[PDB]
Ligand binder design. Sequence first.
Ligand SMILES: COCCn1c(C(=O)O)c(Cc2cccc3ccccc23)c2ccccc21
Ligand SMILES: [Zn+2]
Length: 226
Amino acid sequence: IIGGTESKPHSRPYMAYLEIVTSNGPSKFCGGFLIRRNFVLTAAHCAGRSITVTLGAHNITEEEDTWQKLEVIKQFRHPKYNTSTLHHDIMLLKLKEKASLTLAVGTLPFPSQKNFVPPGRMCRVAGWGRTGVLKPGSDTLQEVKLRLMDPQACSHFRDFDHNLQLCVGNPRKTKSAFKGDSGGPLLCAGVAQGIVSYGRSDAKPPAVFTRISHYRPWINQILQAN
Ligand SMILES: COCCn1c(C(=O)O)c(Cc2cccc3ccccc23)c2ccccc21
Ligand SMILES: [Zn+2]
């Protein structure tokens, strides 16, 4: 998160810190969010050979009783996820066991309504991602309030599509999700509407988020079947 504030500890109890293993490089990290006691939603580009989820974290360097380190038993990457266009950048993670509900750990279920969110409003995104182009990932959960932009603001992302994705962050500000915030939720009035997907290497906003409303059928399909 660039240009944000430190989250009040445990104030976003659905946040998941993902450590992603690949066969041919060191660990990579993403965010995500707990939508059922045994399911975390995140970005498809966060897939790997195996994933661990840490729930209940604030400072991810300091173990505490709120932590739940949970094994992922299966990754459900969107079947149409495209590494060229980056369309359909969404994935569900099934946890081996259901998480414990605590003050620090809880689900964020979707409301019944899946209305298309138009441009104009402010939403908030949280993550442990980098705090600048040349800055490592934050030890502490950070968050930032960003403007939903009209889709034309994201035209320079030539594979952006307004139906599929939200355009997030006023270009006049530095405030932005960034690398390592991948897979984290964008909440608009307390409701998850986006998932951090991608942006510019130089961190100039806006960035592109998966538009959750579009994937609500797929999400439901996976959850009901598993
Ligand atoms: C998990 O990393 C694999 C490589 N990778 C990364 C990454 O962090 O390098 C991202 C995320 C990303 C990259 C560039 C700029 C961004 C600005 C805002 C938010 C996210 C951004 C990403 C997206 C799709 C596919 C592969 C990707
Ligand atoms: Zn704590």
